[PDB]
Design a protein around this ligand. Structure first.
Ligand SMILES: [Mg+2]
Ligand SMILES: [Mg+2]
Ligand SMILES: [Mg+2]
Ligand SMILES: [Mg+2]
Ligand SMILES: [Mg+2]
Ligand SMILES: [Mg+2]
Ligand SMILES: [Mg+2]
Ligand SMILES: [Mg+2]
Ligand SMILES: [Mg+2]
Ligand SMILES: [Mg+2]
Ligand SMILES: [Mg+2]
Ligand SMILES: [Mg+2]
Ligand SMILES: [Mg+2]
Ligand SMILES: [Mg+2]
Ligand SMILES: [Mg+2]
Ligand SMILES: [Mg+2]
Ligand SMILES: [Mg+2]
Ligand SMILES: [Mg+2]
Ligand SMILES: [Mg+2]
Ligand SMILES: [Mg+2]
Ligand SMILES: [Mg+2]
Ligand SMILES: [Mg+2]
Ligand SMILES: [Mg+2]
Ligand SMILES: [Mg+2]
Ligand SMILES: [Mg+2]
Ligand SMILES: [Mg+2]
Ligand SMILES: [Mg+2]
Ligand SMILES: [Mg+2]
Ligand SMILES: [Mg+2]
Ligand SMILES: [Mg+2]
Ligand SMILES: [Mg+2]
Ligand SMILES: [Mg+2]
Ligand SMILES: [Mg+2]
Ligand SMILES: [Mg+2]
Ligand SMILES: [Mg+2]
Ligand SMILES: [Mg+2]
Ligand SMILES: [Mg+2]
Ligand SMILES: [Mg+2]
Ligand SMILES: [Mg+2]
Ligand SMILES: [Mg+2]
Ligand SMILES: [Mg+2]
Ligand SMILES: [Mg+2]
Lengths: 206, 263, 59, 158
RNA sequence: CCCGCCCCUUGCCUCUCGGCGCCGGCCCGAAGCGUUUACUUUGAAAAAAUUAGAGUGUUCAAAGCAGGCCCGAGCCGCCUGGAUACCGCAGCUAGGAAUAAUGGAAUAGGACCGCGGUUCUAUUUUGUUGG
RNA sequence: GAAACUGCGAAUGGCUCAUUAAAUCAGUUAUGGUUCCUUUGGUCGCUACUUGGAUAACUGUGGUAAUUCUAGAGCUAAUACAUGCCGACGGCGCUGACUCCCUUUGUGUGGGAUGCGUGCAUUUAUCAGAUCAAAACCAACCCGGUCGGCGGCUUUGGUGACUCUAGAUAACCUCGGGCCGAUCGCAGCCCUCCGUGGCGGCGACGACCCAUUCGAACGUCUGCCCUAUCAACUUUCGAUGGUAGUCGCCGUGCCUACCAUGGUGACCACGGGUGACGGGGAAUCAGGGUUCGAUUCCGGAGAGGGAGCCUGAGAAACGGCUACCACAUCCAAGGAAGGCAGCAGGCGCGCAAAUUACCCACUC
C-alpha cells in the first residue's frame, strides 16, 4: 500500500534509480487521522512489535496548563484559530500539533480566585452576594491577612491574559500529537508568543 | 530469503577455537541465546563430547544432561547448547570435579580442573553503572548479571569477585597501571601481564599496553582487558603456561629437547 | 473445586511477597549504612584538602 | 537579528521559558531571555557569536538539538547559495596498481553551516562532524572555519 | 654513524590537584604541543574454507586432523597436537624528517606585569539572609 | 490413553540467479536517531475456602456430480473467552474549625479535628541540576556566648559531548484500548487444640518494566565492466534547501502546506549495453599481468507476471489468503480446484547433465 521508502526518489545528480525489490512492511502507510472536534472516539492500531497505538477521532477535552501559575487543568476545546502549516486545517476544524485553540478558561478562574482570594475580569457584582464572595471574601479572622497578603503583590495577571478571561475563552497551543497518542494536551499562550499569534490571526481573517 | 532470525549454524562458519573437524557433517551446535556472545562461547555438547570424551554422540550428551548432573555457576542447566563462557565454573559432583573456562595461550579454552574450595566464587568485569528508580545504583557485568546496591567506589572496567550461590559482590580490583590482567580478544587472546600504560583517544577505542613476565610488550583495546589481580599475584588460578606465548622456535626447541612423545 | 493444595499454593504465593519485602528492607538498610560509611571518608578527604590549602596559603 | 520571526510560526528555543516576574527588572537592559548552548567536546570551542547573538536554528551543533559523533572530515567551500547550507569539495588521489601511479579525484558534500559563522566565503577550509540525517542529502555539520593560507582574507597585518 | 655541551639540542611553559626527592622552605615528569600533509617504519582491528607452511609412515600418495606409550588384564591409565604466515586500497595509531607539496610582518607588529582612558562583568569571601 | 479445544513452530532449512551498475557487496565506522518472541540476570503489597455463559470431541438428522465443503438439533471443560475482590497501610504533603505565652493585630510562640491527593508505566507543562579570588557599612538571624555587635558550614551518577539517568511540583488515564497470579505437579510440620486456627519447602506455567543475547533496519568514508554514432541532465508529474506539520519503530521531501532557486557534470554527470547477482575465491604466471567466479561459506533477490493484505516478536510469506493477466484440470454445466527455480520422475529445448531407491544409525 502506501510506502515511506527512499528508493522511488531520484538520486542527488538528478538520475533515476531502478528498484531491486518489492515493497517491504517496515516501510508502511496507515493514512492520516484528521482529528475533528466532538464526542470522543479512539481507534487502536497494532504496530511493529505489538505496541498498540491510539489514533484519535473527534476529541473534545484536553489537559492544558498555565506556566506562569504552574496550574494545569482539564478543559474543553472550543475551536481552532490558527495553523502554521496549512489554512484548510482551520476551515475543517482539524486538530493537530502546534494548532491554536480556544479553551474554556473556567477552571483557571476558579483556581485563581481560590488561591489569591481576588476576582478575575468581572463586570458587576450581584451574583457574588449568595455565593462566590463566600469563596473570595471568606468569613475568617485567622489566615485572611497573613496568607492572602503574601498571595497579593504577585496576583498581577497581564493586560492580554486578564482581557481573555472576560469573553470566557483563552488561546492555547497543542504540544502533543493526537494522531499518535489520542490526547490533546498543550499550554496556554502568553507574552510574545501570544502577541505574535494574535497579530497573525487578526491579519489573516477579515 | 531471511524474514526472521536464523537457527542453524554451518560447520564451516562455526568459531575456529572450537577445533572441529570438516567431515562429520554440514552443521554445528549453534549455541542458544545466553549470557555470552555466540562467537565467544563454548556450548555444553562440545565441552562434554569433544574435549572430555564423556559422550560419543549427541544422544549421549543429551541423556547425560537430562540427569541433572551438570551445574554451570551453581544452577543446573539441562540444555546441551547452553553458551558457557569466560571465568565460568562447571561442576559434576557425581565424579567430584570442577573446571574453569579460561583461554590458555593460543586463543582457545582449556580444561583447567580446580579445587572445590576455589569453585565457589567467580570474577566478573563491570560494563555498565546506571541508576534505577528511587536512586538505587545497579551493576551490569560481562555475563549479563545485574547487582543492586554496590559500594559507590566501583566503576567501569573494574573486576568484582562474586559468590556463585548468592551473588553478593565480595571484593573488587581496580583498573590501574600495575594490575595483572588477561587479554580476552583480538590477537593476544590469552596472554597475561601488567598494564603499565593506557592510551586515550577521546571518541574511539582507547588502547592499553601490557608487559608480561618476560619483558615482552603488546597492546590491545580497552574492550579486551580483564583485570584479574592486584599485581604479580593472580586472584584465580592460572593454567599451565600462564599466558607467556613462547614463539614457534622456542616451541619447537622445548618440544624436541624434552622429547614429549609418550610416557 | 477447593482443595488443601489450592490453599497451600496461595500460602506460598503470599509468603513469597513477604520474603521480597523483607529482602528489600534489609538490603536498603545495609546499603544506607555503607553509604554513611563512605561519607566520613569523603569528609576526611575534604578536610585534608582544606588543611593543606591553608598550609600552603600561609606563605 | 532585531526580529528573528520570519516564518508563519513563532520561532523560539525549546527548553527556555518566559516566566512570571515583577515590573522593571529591566525595561531595556534585562529583557528576560537566557541562551541555551552546549559544548560539542572533542576540543572544539563554542564560538561567542552563538552565546551572545540570537537566532533560531534547531540544526546548529552548539545551540540546537543535534549530536556530533562518528567521523570528522574537512574540505574547502565551493558554493554558498542555499539557506544555511553550503557545498564543499574534497579532493584526493586514487592509486592504480597496474601502473604504479595515482590519479586525481573529487567528491562533493552538502553540509550545514550555522548562522553562528558569518565570516565564511568561497575558499575557506572547513571542518565537519557527523550527525544523523538532517535532510535528503545532508549528514554533516560545520564545526570550525579556518583560513590561514596565501591570498588570505586580506593583507597580512596580524 | 642513545644521553648533552660553542646559540638549541624532546622544551618552551602555567599553573594545579592528586604521589615522588631533601635540609614551613627548596625542584622535574605529569596539561598544550612541535604550521600541516603526502612518504616511510611500527602497533591495533580485520569469518572459516582455499592458498603458502609446522607436526603426524592413510600400508605409499591424493587426502585427513590426528595420534604415542606401558602394563600377563591387577593404571581402572598416562603424554601430546589441533601452530604460523599472507589478508592490497580506504579508515585508526605512534616514531622518522631526506624528497615533494603548502604558509608566515612591507601601508606591520612581535614582546615585555609598560601604561593611559572608556566599557562589560563573573558572583566568592567579609558567618549567614537581603539595600 | 483415541479424538478435539488450547499453547508453540510453520519467517529456519532447501532451490535457482530472472532482475540489479554507487544499486547489491566488501573493509570501516554510528544509532546520544530505532524495534527485538526466546535465553540469562534484576523487578513482583496501593464470593475470595474461588465468579459468569458457551462452544468442540461425543450423540443424533441431513444437503450437493464434486473438495481437507458444511448446516440444523442435544450435552460438557480451560492456562480458551469474560469478570473480579481479600490483605498489613501503624502511609506524608496540602487544607485550617479552632486553640496557647508574651509583642493586640502582622508576627516572635506550640497543638489541631476536618477534608483532598498520595506505587511503577503514559501525555503535557514547570523547578532545581550545589562547592569560583577578598573585604566595609546598614535591616534580620545560627554557633564560640551574651541584653550594642565581633572569629566561624553549604553536601546523587555517568559521557569527548545529550533537551541523559535519578529528584521535586500540577494535572492527565487509553475502557471494550497498561502492571500489580481466580492457573497445574511433588513430597511435610505447631495447634491456650481437635481439623481446622495456623505455617513449610521444592518445581511447572504466565506476566508490565530494565539490562544481556540472537538479530533486523536505517546511516558515514573508500572501492566498478563497455560505450561520446550518449554533452549537458534534474524541476508541481519533489528536482536541491528552509519553517510548521501528517505518517512511520525511529533520523529524513517519506509525504502535505508555504517560501527560496537551487543540485550534478570533461576528475565523464545523464542516457544506452552487459550471453552482469557481489565477495571469499579459480586457471595461467620470471617480474608485471590476463581471463574466469550460474556452483556447496557470507550477503542479496525471487517463487508463472504484476498488485493488495490477514495472523504474528518477526512476512508484503506463496508447502498462506484476495483480485487482474497468461496457461491449464474436473463438471451432473449450476459449480469447484492450481502453481516442482524442494526430492525423485516426465515433456520441450538443445552439442550438452543421474534412481519415480533405503534410513533418521551420524550432524543438527
Ligand atoms: Mg527484484
Ligand atoms: Mg513487546
Ligand atoms: Mg532462507
Ligand atoms: Mg540450538
Ligand atoms: Mg594446505
Ligand atoms: Mg598433507
Ligand atoms: Mg593499509
Ligand atoms: Mg605520522
Ligand atoms: Mg496423557
Ligand atoms: Mg518457544
Ligand atoms: Mg508462528
Ligand atoms: Mg538441482
Ligand atoms: Mg545503467
Ligand atoms: Mg559508498
Ligand atoms: Mg560489509
Ligand atoms: Mg558496509
Ligand atoms: Mg526472567
Ligand atoms: Mg450446539
Ligand atoms: Mg522540511
Ligand atoms: Mg521535522
Ligand atoms: Mg540551475
Ligand atoms: Mg549512469
Ligand atoms: Mg543501463
Ligand atoms: Mg543476467
Ligand atoms: Mg563479474
Ligand atoms: Mg607474477
Ligand atoms: Mg556467485
Ligand atoms: Mg544465466
Ligand atoms: Mg545445481
Ligand atoms: Mg551485510
Ligand atoms: Mg520473498
Ligand atoms: Mg516456471
Ligand atoms: Mg507467536
Ligand atoms: Mg507473494
Ligand atoms: Mg518457503
Ligand atoms: Mg492453498
Ligand atoms: Mg512448490
Ligand atoms: Mg525436480
Ligand atoms: Mg534429443
Ligand atoms: Mg556431461
Ligand atoms: Mg537428454
Ligand atoms: Mg537423526
Amino acid at each position: 500500500g502506501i510506502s515511506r521508502d527512499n528508493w522511488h526518489k531520484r538520486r542527488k545528480t538528478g538520475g533515476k534509480r531502478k528498484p531491486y525489490h518489492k515493497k517491504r512492511k517496515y516501510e508502511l502507510g496507515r493514512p492520516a487521522a484528521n482529528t475533528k472536534i466532538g464526542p470522543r472516539r479512539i481507534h487502536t492500531v497494532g504496530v511493529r512489535g505489538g505496541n498498540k497505538k491510539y489514533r484519535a477521532l473527534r476529541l473534545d477535552v484536553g489537559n492544558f496548563s498555565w506556566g506562569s501559575e504552574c496550574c494545569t487543568r482539564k478543559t474543553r476545546i472550543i475551536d481552532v484559530v490558527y495553523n502554521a502549516s496549512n489554512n484548510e486545517l482551520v476551515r475543517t476544524k482539524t486538530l493537530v500539533k502546534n494548532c491554536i485553540v480556544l479553551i474554556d478558561s473556567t477552571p483557571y478562574r476558579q483556581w485563581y480566585e481560590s488561591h489569591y482570594a481576588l476576582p478575575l475580569g468581572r463586570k458587576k457584582g450581584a451574583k457574588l452576594t449568595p455565593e462566590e464572595e463566600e469563596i473570595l471574601n471568606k468569613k475568617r479572622s485567622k489566615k485572611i491577612q497573613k496568607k492572602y497578603d503574601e498571595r497579593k503583590k504577585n496576583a498581577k495577571i497581564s493586560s492580554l491574559l486578564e482581557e481573555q478571561f472576560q469573553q470566557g475563552k483563552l488561546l492555547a497551543c497543542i504540544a502533543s500529537r493526537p494522531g499518535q497518542c489520542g490526547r490533546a494536551d498543550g499550554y496556554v499562550l502568553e507574552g510574545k508568543e501570544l502577541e505574535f499569534y494574535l497579530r497573525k490571526i487578526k491579519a489573516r481573517k477579515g | 530469503m531471511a524474514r526472521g532470525p536464523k537457527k542453524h549454524l554451518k560447520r564451516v562458519a562455526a568459531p575456529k577455537h572450537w577445533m572441529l573437524d570438516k567431515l562429520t557433517s554440514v552443521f554445528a551446535p549453534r549455541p542458544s541465546t545466553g549470557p555470552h556472545k555466540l562467537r565467544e562461547c563454548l556450548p555444553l555438547i562440545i565441552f562434554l563430547r569433544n574435549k572430555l570424551k564423556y559422550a560419543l554422540t549427541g544422544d549421549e550428551v543429551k541423556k547425560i544432561c537430562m540427569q541433572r548432573f551438570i551445574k554451570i555457576d551453581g544452577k543446573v542447566r539441562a540444555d546441551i547448547t547452553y553458551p558457557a563462557g569466560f571465568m565460568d565454573v562447571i561442576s559434576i559432583d557425581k565424579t567430584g570435579e570442577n573446571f574453569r573456562l579460561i583461554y590458555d595461550t593460543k586463543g582457545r579454552f582449556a580444561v583447567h580442573r580446580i579445587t572445590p574450595e576455589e569453585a565457589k566464587y567467580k570474577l566478573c568485569k563491570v560494563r555498565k553503572i546506571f541508576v534505577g528508580t528511587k536512586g538505587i545504583p545497579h551493576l551490569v557485568t560481562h555475563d549479563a548479571r545485574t547487582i543492586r546496591y554496590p559500594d559507590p567506589l566501583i566503576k567501569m572496567n573494574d573486576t568484582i569477585q562474586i559468590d556463585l550461590e548468592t551473588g553478593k559482590i565480595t571484593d573488587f580490583i581496580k583498573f590501574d597501571t600495575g594490575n595483572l590482567c588477561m587479554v580476552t580478544g583480538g590477537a593476544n587472546l590469552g596472554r597475561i601481564g601488567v598494564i603499565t600504560n593506557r592510551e586515550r583517544h577521546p571518541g574511539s577505542f582507547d588502547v592499553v599496553h601490557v608487559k608480561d613476565a618476560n619483558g615482552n610488550s603488546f597492546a590491545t583495546r580497552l574492550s579486551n582487558i580483564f583485570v584479574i589481580g592486584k599485581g604479580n599475584k593472580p586472584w584465580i588460578s592460572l593454567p599451565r603456561g600462564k599466558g607467556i606465548r613462547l614463539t614457534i622456535a622456542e616451541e619447537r626447541d622445548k618440544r624436541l629437547a624434552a622429547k614429549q612423545s609418550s610416557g | 473445586l477447593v482443595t488443601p493444595r489450592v490453599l497451600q499454593h496461595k500460602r506460598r504465593r503470599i509468603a513469597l511477597k513477604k520474603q521480597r519485602t523483607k529482602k528489600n528492607k534489609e538490603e536498603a538498610a545495609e546499603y544506607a549504612k555503607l553509604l554513611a560509611k563512605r561519607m566520613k571518608e569523603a569528609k576526611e578527604k575534604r578536610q585534608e584538602q582544606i588543611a593543606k590549602r591553608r598550609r600552603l596559603s600561609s606563605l | 537579528m532585531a526580529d528573528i520571526q520570519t516564518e508563519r510560526a513563532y520561532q523560539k528555543q525549546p527548553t527556555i521559558f518566559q516566566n512570571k516576574k515583577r515590573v522593571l527588572l529591566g525595561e531595556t537592559g534585562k529583557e528576560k531571555l537566557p541562551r541555551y548552548y552546549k559544548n560539542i567536546g572533542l576540543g572544539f570551542k563554542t564560538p561567542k557569536e552563538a552565546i551572545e547573538g540570537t537566532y533560531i536554528d534547531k540544526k546548529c551543533p552548539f545551540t540546537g538539538n543535534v549530536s556530533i559523533r562518528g567521523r570528522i572530515l574537512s574540505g574547502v567551500v565551493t558554493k554558498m547559495k542555499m539557506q544555511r547550507t553550503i557545498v564543499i569539495r574534497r579532493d584526493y588521489l586514487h592509486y592504480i596498481r597496474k601502473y604504479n601511479r595515482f590519479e586525481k579525484r573529487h567528491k562533493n558534500m552538502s553540509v550545514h553551516l550555522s548562522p553562528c559563522f558569518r565570516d565564511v566565503q568561497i575558499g575557506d577550509i572547513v571542518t565537519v562532524g557527523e550527525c544523523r540525517p538532517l535532510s535528503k542529502t545532508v549528514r554533516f555539520n560545520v564545526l570550525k572555519v579556518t583560513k590561514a593560507a596565501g591570498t588570505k582574507k586580506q593583507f597580512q597585518k596580524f
